[PDB]
Amino acid sequence: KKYSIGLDIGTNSVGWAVITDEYKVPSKKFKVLGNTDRHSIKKNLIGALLFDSGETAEATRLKRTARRRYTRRKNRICYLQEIFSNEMAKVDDSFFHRLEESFLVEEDKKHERHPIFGNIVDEVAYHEKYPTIYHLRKKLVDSTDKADLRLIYLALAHMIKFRGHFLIEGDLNPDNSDVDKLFIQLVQTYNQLFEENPINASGVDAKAILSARLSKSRRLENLIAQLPGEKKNGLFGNLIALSLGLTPNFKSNFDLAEDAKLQLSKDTYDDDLDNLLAQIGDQYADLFLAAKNLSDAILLSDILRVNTEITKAPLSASMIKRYDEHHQDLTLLKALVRQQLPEKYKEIFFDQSKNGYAGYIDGGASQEEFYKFIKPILEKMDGTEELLVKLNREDLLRKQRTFDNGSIPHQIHLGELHAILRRQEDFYPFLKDNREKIEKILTFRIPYYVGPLARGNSRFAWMTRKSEETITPWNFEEVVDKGASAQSFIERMTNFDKNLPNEKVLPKHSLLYEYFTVYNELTKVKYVTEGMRKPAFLSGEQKKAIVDLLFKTNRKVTVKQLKEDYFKKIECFDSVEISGVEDRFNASLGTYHDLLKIIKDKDFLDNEENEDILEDIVLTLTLFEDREMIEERLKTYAHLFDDKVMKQLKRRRYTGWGRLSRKLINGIRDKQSGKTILDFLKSDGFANRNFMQLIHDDSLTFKEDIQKAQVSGQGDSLHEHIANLAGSPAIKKGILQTVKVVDELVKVMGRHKPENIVIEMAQKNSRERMKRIEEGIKELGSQILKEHPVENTQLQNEKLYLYYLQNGRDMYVDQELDINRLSDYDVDHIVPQSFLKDDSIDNKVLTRSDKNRGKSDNVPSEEVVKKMKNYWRQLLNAKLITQRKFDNLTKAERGGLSELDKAGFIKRQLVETRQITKHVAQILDSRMNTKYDENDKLIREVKVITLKSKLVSDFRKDFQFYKVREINNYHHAHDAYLNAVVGTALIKKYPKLESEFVYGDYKVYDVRKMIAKSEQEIGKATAKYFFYSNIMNFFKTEITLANGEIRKRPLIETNGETGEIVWDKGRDFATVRKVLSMPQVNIVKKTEVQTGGFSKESILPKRNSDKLIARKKDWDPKKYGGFDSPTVAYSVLVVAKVEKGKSKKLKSVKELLGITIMERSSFEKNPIDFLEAKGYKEVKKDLIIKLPKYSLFELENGRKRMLASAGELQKGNELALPSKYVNFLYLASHYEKLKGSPEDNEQKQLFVEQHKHYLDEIIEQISEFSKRVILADANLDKVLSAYNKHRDKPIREQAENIIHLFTLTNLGAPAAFKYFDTTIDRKRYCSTKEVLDATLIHQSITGLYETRIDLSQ
DNA sequence: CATAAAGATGAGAGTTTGGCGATTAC
RNA sequence: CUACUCUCAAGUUUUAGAGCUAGAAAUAGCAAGUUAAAAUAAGGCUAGUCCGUUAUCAACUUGAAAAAGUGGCACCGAGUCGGUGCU
DNA sequence: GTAATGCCATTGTCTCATCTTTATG
Prior knowledge:
PDB class: hydrolase/rna/dna
Assembly: tetrameric
Keywords: DNase, complex, ribonucleoprotein, genome editor, HYDROLASE-RNA-DNA complex
Distance between the termini: 43 Å
Radius of gyration: 38 Å
Strand order of the largest sheet: 4-3-29-28-23-24-25
Entry title: Cas9:sgRNA:DNA (S. pyogenes) forming a 3-base-pair R-loop
Oligomer: monomer
Structural class: alpha+beta
Name: CRISPR-associated endonuclease Cas9/Csn1
């Protein structure tokens, strides 16, 4: 008959339930297909689908880019060999061939085993002459003699293969990069800028001091020690500290009132420097620029350590020096160890298993592990100086190829490559002919805006070709259409506004965007002067004046500057108070002041004709990062300014994107008003509506415009609708599964669509509240922390946290609270629970008795507000409480609670803020409702109700339908059922509130029809729904107000307008409890083929094991190593015969074979050939069964297993624990944190104590379940033993640990768990043999329709 | 001389659950 | 708030970096250790300086595929669902 | 010879606690 569907959408589960009109879940008989003797099963229409989380595409993206990088590097090497080929053929015929075959063993190698020269003599000579490649490189850079072409290729190939990073753009040279020249330039600029009492620095050795390997502070102090005239707090000292990476404070150098901190690494240094420079002038700009340059020099100096000018290749010389120091330190270490500590020498240099030196060189031991291993050895021995200062500086026995080399720019390798090519240029003519070619190979980098160089067969590529020839680094400029490629790049990278599709989102640093957010924050500001005594919103002229005078003059505008430089200067207001914002305005016009610094034309920035130009420049600087394409895209504006500010503009870069588009902010226009969003922000009369309020408010056309355009952006298929959503792929997967669940459920119900579909979308904090308490105490001045010290761990208690939040004072009475008598003290709600269900700290106060609030059922009376307003104002301005809490505390002074407040509460409880939920409701509504009439009106047969989780949660807490997620997976289905119940109750009780929850166009009924005037005038004869603003009151039998008066509600709740019973407080709660108590809930684990990586990525050494997998076709893993541990895509049941014994007699077998992900395509191409290659004969082709992961098997006594693999199983059963034990567990574990009234808490406490034997009964229940199903008797014995060991412990702790015990019985993969301090390790099901003779159960998405196959055959 | 703030040197972790080799038992 | 481009440096793995002295070996004393090539999902055809780890997937029928179809209703109960009447 | 019972996992990231140094009253 009539029914409704409840849904609980999550990221790992989708709960679903079908309910009738009497809130009952139907139980139906379903047909069972297959070849067994079971043809029917009785199932309840309630369940939950389980599935693995959807994964994000990040890992795939990284892997893809890595593959591209490897490919392109190999192609670079192929280019180099292509240039060297013809001339190498005359010198050596099989050089490159030997290099290519370097990996093969001598047996499989067709050429000589020696790569470079082919004979052992020249190899030994080469390695002894050059023990590292940097020796050969340094020779080829510093030797004029002719060198062998093979070694030249080795150097060039090493510099090209590992070419270095590309973060620094352009040429690099010592004139603008070395520390010496930049230090001289810095002190020259310094002395030039002052010249009166200047600093003279001639004896100092800036290189030796700054480049030395020591801590930053010690280098600073050593340089100050080298300058007797300067001090650490001086200007030069603060500049050096800034250049080294410290956080210097410039207040003492200029006596500034506000602290100005500078950090070069911080992204906001430039504008901070611009503020600083604005105070002292722009003459010091180049000084700080040189400081920045000096900082870069120091970083460059950390790599360029051997920059002594003797060599021309700084890097290779530095690696040589590192080699030499390594050799010296090594020999010294061996000498010292052999002399002083003969024992354990083998452990350091021979063992290699415990991270010794042999582990550092030959084993898998990092540099930090080797240092950690040898630090106590060096500390114990004598004569270990110099090695330890090198160890602490992380420069002891370093290798030449380490993790630090990522900092090496590619200009260095380019320099060495140019040097080598120039030295051997005349000796080899083809180096003269192909110098720029090789240089281009090293320097060429594919731009971001070009992307993959495809030819139509790449899903990710977009570039356009101006020819039909192989793209090389040399002809890239004349084959790649950079213009069209950049245009396509723009079109792809521009995301569309979620509110309005088909319109590009503006950059995050767009001028119009910053104006929008600045006005959006400014419009919510209220000011009170001396006389009006009522809050007044800012007028249009006031907003424009404030913006122009403050926001267009300073990057940061604070409330003090606002009252001092506007209200006092223009409005002549001495004292002003502002509530809208806190310390300062979060929004700012950063881009405005940036462009003002660039072009120095304030009037040009305010011309409304130049808006599009500036927006285009900002868009260009946001989209691109390459200097050349920026130069190309800024040539049109060359006539506006040129050669200074254009250059400075090209160096400026912006990053980020906004959420709104231009057409939304200043495009679409209200038909009646004729004002855009920004126009409404600037001027809106008395009341000022913010952006979110204009979208919400139905009196304007903006909501209609956003709604009518929503269906234009979307597509026709379900996949496109889900792909367009704004969420993680996991919740999108859950949404698709939800849609399919709905489809299957309406199929099960004879293709009858439901009436309703209810949808629910399923240490730092302690530190923040602790800091809040400390800041409030420091601001106030009451040293409660001195007399009563507390830590962040103890502050989780509600009454103690409120005690410290309220300055250790009673909120209603002028007396101090007793620190050690909080149990006698009560926690009161500022706004009663009868009006709004808010149990947060934002709406709670602590007092000795809640009778001091007075006799009213509203906010606390005026007699207390008038007395405590001063103390509440001190707690307000001290950030002890928030603005909303102060507003609620002082509501009686402004009449008390009002109709607007109650409507705000209703909207807070009933409306869903999450956009994804509205889009899911839209998808289900579009799929369910598709009929029309004669007119162009949509017939809405199915109502899609959107509920908040708080409603169902409070429903559980109020009527003891407690949720314990750790027991089983039934709670998803139960949540779905309760969602259905609450949704149907609300739609039956309040039809006029359909527009709040039900999706679609609906009436706009306001507060007048709903909110009643008074308690006695409930209004049953006038349609008024409720006097008390809490929507969930009709479920309750009694309503306890804040005074203690117990209001009574009828036993049967009925709708006022239609006279339909909506809730029977006896029969319906009994029905709900019975439904939650049902043990047969359809839990289905979505069977999924496994995809992704073939195996573990580890490349293991060679081994005599057939589990190893070849890394290349002809790389036999017994000789070469490879991978192991492949992932099984799915398992395959094979019934065939295998050869047994010497005589190879054919024996019939039935077994599971794991088809790995790598094997999948080959197996599916021809299964029989694959199986015969595996050894199977006479395979029964028609009996092959594909068994993906989580395939379900039943064996005996209802015991179930899920397939994890071809050789392993998971638990397949659910423990249907009775409701009374679930509620007992919830209550026992929530002993101290009940968070309820004292009487209620006492009832729960006495229930726990009177029912403490449920602990033993739950243990018994787990035991019998495990013996029937789990069959892990070692762990069960462990559990029972531990439980007997800890029967003395408190009830709460035993409850908490039984909660941990339910992982033994949970559905899915076995997992380890802890009972108190005893760890119980997982018992695995390491054989799939038994399920080859069990019943396989193929399940529908809902688990209702099934087919059972008896694999005995 | 005492208290508060910032930076540096080690501390662990950074899921889960399937594969594989050693181990143990019949 | 997902998706995307370009790119670096390590790691790991086989070979090249001859090991020297005794001893029938087993095993002992020492000398050196820092680097390089190649691969970095097997591979694929569309042969690109492209693609290969995301999404998607119970069973059965028809199809190469996108995709269409296939499973009676009440009542009394509730240990993973059972029983009875109707049809 | 066959069937049932601890370690490892490609990454360049985190955050917390204690000690030392500098600044202010």
